[PDB]
């Protein structure tokens, strides 16, 4: 059922001339400097214009081709910069010694000292993004395979940018093309995910795992043949992988045990690279692919068979929840924020799961070997996952103000959480308080007992145990799963649970992580800082429309500063302001997750193995008796590990010395916007406009102070920028030195 409008919007440079053409109030011309900031704020907010959902949805789908172009330009840029300006061909010969490097610096002002010696006769910035592990995991051998990929990416970036013109300015879809969410889920689960992972399963079997097996033998780099000669000359897929001469017929006679050489279930880490077995990833992405192609045949399309989501949701209702899930289809098929809240809180929560499932199970050749890479991949996608969960909480509060409808959402499970929203929050208010005392106060207890010279009264491994019984048990189940509850495996899912120490050269790839009293406290700090973040975000969702303080808060809007100084004072009551307060706790919560990671792994996992198997860790094993006091987090983590970032002048780590101080500045700069108010700064400009009125330099566009909401927004953007960039420059200069 494809119906497409023919030329809705003429392609012209007319509207590039006048700025702010989109809104009727904002297009009449600027009068103050408030107009300048509202142009960049209301820019990509396509929902405020009309009530025509057909017209808004065409802008939304075409702009989504715009973001696909800039990711592809970025991605093909990283391959092209890794083609010319890298040591990728010298890295393949010795990944144990050659450091991953791109970004050669122009030598102008003495910043050629940033081009330090990474090994291999090459001077440049030691990268930490791990693209050399990806390209080897893809099987790229020489530079020319990186050129044709990057040049191929620039063509593929042009098709996305052309179709964004085409599907908006030339051939734009109608409304009912978008609301075929049964037809969307069938194509996107099968063709994108299932056929994407089936095609990629064909890329490991025919191409990648033959090359990565020849690499593990230590043959050469040039002497390994081209990967299209593996398809032509079938005699090289039979020297390795001997279960290949039987050909294609064991697939169709269900003799799938014939394929046991290259679709294995080894279940562990490769002892040569310290990565996953390439044959296990082949049987993974194939078994992933069968499940998606089956499950994408679920929802009903033009051919009668299939489930209907309006008939799935309306059956699931109970005695407690009244009408149940009846009415949630119309919320998710009309509102765009209800989709955007759902696709972002569950993709942001997915990104944190990816970070945990990649440090313990390193999926790339020589990933766990490089400590400088593995620390930064975790801490990157932690923050990327955390901003999106706050965004799903943000665009859910926008749903409640603009797109919530009482007629549809009558007595369903969305309605029944607004009746008992006082019971939800106040029982959540108790747990945030309960976790505050019984997790953080056990650090304040241990600060004081060690300061009072009473070490026998502390919550440590020696004095008063707090052993994590329910997580020491689950590690013992996942250690004993080969031969038992999963007999076909050999080693566990990872060595983080049990198993042994797998050394790659000298450096530990993965060691069994032993949980103790310090690990009990810091996993309950994590539950504390997450439940408080939920408390702030959910209060902005439930109290978005009204409260007992403001009975008509949805009348004012999603984003308004206050309702005046009355009722004691009602500043920061809006649903925007609870997104504002949750960004700090998201910053607070995720900063401890990446501090728990960066010091548990250095104290209890990473290090160098001697000849007899003795594992000599980085920090000597001091997480046990020092991560129980706040003095110990200050002494042995912030003070002791910063000796590589501030002593780095006159060397190649000089930029991390400058970004460490430069981010302490921008953090401190943000407090001028947070602490002060707007009405001070408007008075000060009136005394500066006077001296600009006197000498006849009076601007026609009147200066105004930043608005109340913007002064909060500037103060949190400069806050999060300088606080994360402090840690960005602290993690790198510490781990590009001890790794």
């Amino acid at each position: 059922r494809v119906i497409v409008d023919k030329d809705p919007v003429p392609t012209s440079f007319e509207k590039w001339a006048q700025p702010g053409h989109f809104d009727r109030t904002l297009a009449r011309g600027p009068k103050t400097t408030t107009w300048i900031w509202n142009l960049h704020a209301l820019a990509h907010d396509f929902d405020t214009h009309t009530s025509d959902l057909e017209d808004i949805s065409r802008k939304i789908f075409a702009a989504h081709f715009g973001h696909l172009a800039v990711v592809t330009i970025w991605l093909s840029g990283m391959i092209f910069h890794g083609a010319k300006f890298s040591n990728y061909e010298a890295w393949l010969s010795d990944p144990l010694n050659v450091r991953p490097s791109a970004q050669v610096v122009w030598p102008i002002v003495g910043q050629d000292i940033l081009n330090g010696d990474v090994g291999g006769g090459f001077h440049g910035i030691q990268i930490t993004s791990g693209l050399f592990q990806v390209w080897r995991g893809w099987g790229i051998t020489n530079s020319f395979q990186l050129y044709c990929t990057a040049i191929g990416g620039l063509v593929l970036a042009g098709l996305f940018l052309f179709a964004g013109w085409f599907h908006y300015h030339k051939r734009a879809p109608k409304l009912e093309w978008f609301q075929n969410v049964e037809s969307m889920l069938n194509h996107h689960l099968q063709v994108l995910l299932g056929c994407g992972s089936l095609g990629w399963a064909g890329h490991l079997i025919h191409v990648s795992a033959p090359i990565n097996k020849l690499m593990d033998a230590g043959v050469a780099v040039k002497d390994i043949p081209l990967p299209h000669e593996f398809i032509l000359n079938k005699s090289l897929l039979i020297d390795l992988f001997p279960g290949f001469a039987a050909g294609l017929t064991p697939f169709f006679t269900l003799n799938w045990g014939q394929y046991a050489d290259f679709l294995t279930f080894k279940g562990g880490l490769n002892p040569v690279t310290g990565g996953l077995w390439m044959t296990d990833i082949a049987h993974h992405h194939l078994a992933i692919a069968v499940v998606f192609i089956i499950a994408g045949h679920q929802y009903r399309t033009n051919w009668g068979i299939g489930h209907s989501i309006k008939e799935i949701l309306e059956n699931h209702k109970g005695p407690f929840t009244g009408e149940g899930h009846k009415g949630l289809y119309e919320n998710l098929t009309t509102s765009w924020h209800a989709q955007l809240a759902t696709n972002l809180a569950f993709l942001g929560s997915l990104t944190i799961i990816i970070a945990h499932h990649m440090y313990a199970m390193p999926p790339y050749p020589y990933l766990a070997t490089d400590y400088a890479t593995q620390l930064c991949i975790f801490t990157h996608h932690i923050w990327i996952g955390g901003f999106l969960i706050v965004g799903g909480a943000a665009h859910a509060a926008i749903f409640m103000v603009r797109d919530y409808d009482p007629v549809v959402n009558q007595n369903n499970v969305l309605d029944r959480v607004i009746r008992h929203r006082d019971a939800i929050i106040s029982h959540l208010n108790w747990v945030c308080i309960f976790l505050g005392f019984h997790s953080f106060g056990l650090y304040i207890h241990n600060d004081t007992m060690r300061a009072l010279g009473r070490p026998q009264d502390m919550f440590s491994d020696t004095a008063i145990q707090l052993q994590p019984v329910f997580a020491q048990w689950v590690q013992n189940l996942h250690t004993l799963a080969p031969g038992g509850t999963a007999p076909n495996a050999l080693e566990p899912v990872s060595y983080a649970f049990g198993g042994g120490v797998l050394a790659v050269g000298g450096k530990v790839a993965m060691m069994p992580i032993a949980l103790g009293t310090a690990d009990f406290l810091i996993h309950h700090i994590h539950a504390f800082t997450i439940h408080v973040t939920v408390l702030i975000l959910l209060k902005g969702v439930l109290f978005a429309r009204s409260s007992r303080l403001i009975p008509d808060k949805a009348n004012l809007g999603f984003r308004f500063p206050c309702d005046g100084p009355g009722r004691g004072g009602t500043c920061q009551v809006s649903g925007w302001d609870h997104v504002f307060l949750g960004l700090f706790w998201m910053y607070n919560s995720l900063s401890i997750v990446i501090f728990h990671f960066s010091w548990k792994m250095q104290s209890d996992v990473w290090g160098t193995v001697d000849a007899a198997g003795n594992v000599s860790h980085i920090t000597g094993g001091n997480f046990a008796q020092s991560a129980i006091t706040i003095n110990g987090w200050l002494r042995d983590f912030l003070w002791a590990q910063a000796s590589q970032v501030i002593n780095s002048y006159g060397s190649a780590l000089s930029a991390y010395g400058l970004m460490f101080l430069g981010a302490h500045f921008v953090w401190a700069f943000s407090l001028m916007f947070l602490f002060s108010g707007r009405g001070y700064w408007q008075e000060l400009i009136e005394s500066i406009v006077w001296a600009h009125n006197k000498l006849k330099v009076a601007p026609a566009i009147q200066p105004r102070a930043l608005s109340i909401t913007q002064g909060r927004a500037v103060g949190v953007a400069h806050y999060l920028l300088g606080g994360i960039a402090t840690t960005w420059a602290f993690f790198h200069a510490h781990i590009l030195s001890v790794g």
Partner: protein
């Protein structure tokens, strides 16, 4: 409660009466302005200090002004 002073400069715009959410304000006839009515605040024990009435008034400077005074239960906005 609070204190709502209404000066003689307003024009009878009826934007302040249609914005006070506890309905403190009302229009009385007054032969001064062009619309021949002035805002009046006969129920200032109900005023919650919202200053929606000062936001909606056109005239420069404001004909209506809310002076924040002693805060009883009705002006704190307490349902309890």
């Amino acid at each position: 409660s609070h204190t709502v002073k209404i000066y003689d400069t307003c024009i009878g715009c009826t934007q302040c009466v249609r914005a006070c959410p506890t309905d403190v304000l009302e229009m009385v006839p007054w032969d001064g302005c062009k619309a021949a009515q002035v805002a009046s605040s006969p129920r200032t024990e109900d005023c919650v200090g919202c200053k929606r009435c000062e936001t909606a008034c056109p005239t420069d400077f404001l004909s209506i002004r809310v002076y924040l005074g002693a805060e009883t239960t009705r002006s704190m906005g307490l349902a309890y």
